[PDB]
Paper text:
The stalk region of GP2 connects the globular body of GP to the viral or cell membrane and is the most C-terminal section of GP that has been visualized to high resolution. The antibody BDBV223 was identified in a human survivor of the 2007 BDBV outbreak in Uganda and targets the GP2 stalk. Here we describe two crystal structures of BDBV223: one alone, and one in complex with a synthetic peptide corresponding to its BDBV GP stalk epitope, at 2.0 and 3.7 Å resolution, respectively.
BDBV223 Fab was co-crystallized with a synthetic peptide 620TDKIDQIIHDFIDKPL635 representing residues 620–635 of the BDBV GP2 stalk epitope. The peptide in this BDBV223 complex structure contains GP2 residues 620–635 and maintains its alpha-helical structure until residue I627. The BDBV223 light chain interacts with the C-terminal section of the GP peptide.
Numbering used by the authors:
A (entry chain A): 1 to 223
B (entry chain B): 1 to 214
C (entry chain D): 620 to 634
Amino acid sequence: QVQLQQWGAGLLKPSETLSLTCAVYGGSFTTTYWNWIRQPPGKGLEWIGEVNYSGNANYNPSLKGRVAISVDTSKNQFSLRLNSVTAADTAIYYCTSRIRSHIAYSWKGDVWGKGTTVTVSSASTKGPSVFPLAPSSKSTSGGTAALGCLVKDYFPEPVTVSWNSGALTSGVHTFPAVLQSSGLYSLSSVVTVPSSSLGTQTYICNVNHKPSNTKVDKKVEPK
Amino acid sequence: EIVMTQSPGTLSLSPGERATLSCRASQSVPRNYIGWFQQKPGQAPRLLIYGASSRAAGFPDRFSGSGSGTDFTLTITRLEPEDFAMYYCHQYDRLPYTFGQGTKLEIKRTVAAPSVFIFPPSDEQLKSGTASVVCLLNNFYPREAKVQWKVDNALQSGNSQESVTEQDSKDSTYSLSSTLTLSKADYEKHKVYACEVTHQGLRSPVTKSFNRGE
Amino acid sequence: TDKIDQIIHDFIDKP
């Protein structure tokens, strides 16, 4: 019945200490070892460190100097402290327990709480720019026609795009965000519709960005 | 340090078939401490088997691990659609801990050529001083496709960025978007903008192009 | 089993 409750600061500026903490319900610190791992976006898992109740800590050989982890059994919680962070450390941090893998142990596997997304960026909050994508260049009659909306220069990551206020769910492709050189995200959404509908139909894309409280609806029509 | 090599690294199968994923250790693992994680897109990883042969609670018996020493294997029997995800192999025996590069298990479909479209920049975007030309490859399988930008027939490189959708849950295809970024001046200095696509469903590359100022 | 799990905690220490 073990459960782990993780809280920490997601957004930080470069060269700022990263302090995350993870809490243990249902089991003692002395019974099981604890460790911190991070998963960068769309990349392989990485194990930054591991800790024991006694304070002994073993860290990944690459980051040893920068990372320090401390654990306090008093509150049944352990904390990861990292120093001199850089954009390359952007990742989703998970606090887990190493696998027990023994017949004698209770709850013989491992469980961890929902990871905390950690984004290291210098840029502050900014609202997205919505630019339409031309629906047709001499489009083929009785054939696929492609409409799009372009979201650019927006931070933080979360954004939601839906066509005709979600009324159009079919043939809708909303692409993942891309972080540009400047440090701001760029994303695009596209839909395919019958060429006959363009004269008949109106297509509006709704872009919503909560952190920046910026909501922009745009109309894409052939010109 | 024990380096972990998973193979093949991309596995394309269909419902009903048998899946075999391989995980190989650079050095011997004395205590046979190994685990396998299932990770669905956007979802946290779930540990699946631990140790060599031990299955974690909450998973059907069709998942079975085996192997020892330098070589380990994970087998999925009578795979249902819900099994397709990325699988990592982990070693907790000897410090430092390491994870495998991962094996992508995808759903096999018939080859489908992409529907290619090119979108010029909007005039309102040109008012801002930047021009982004977008090229869409829609509903294609397999995942591998090559986008090549041409401006006045001049090959473009390094100025573009790609983004790919996860395999669609309905038709089991992929989609890809490519963005070519140029300054308004550089955009105004050229006429013909073309996106050339190569994919295994097309005998020859398909090129979608436009002329500035149509 | 907790008191036992503490004793299993002895030999699995990080090598």
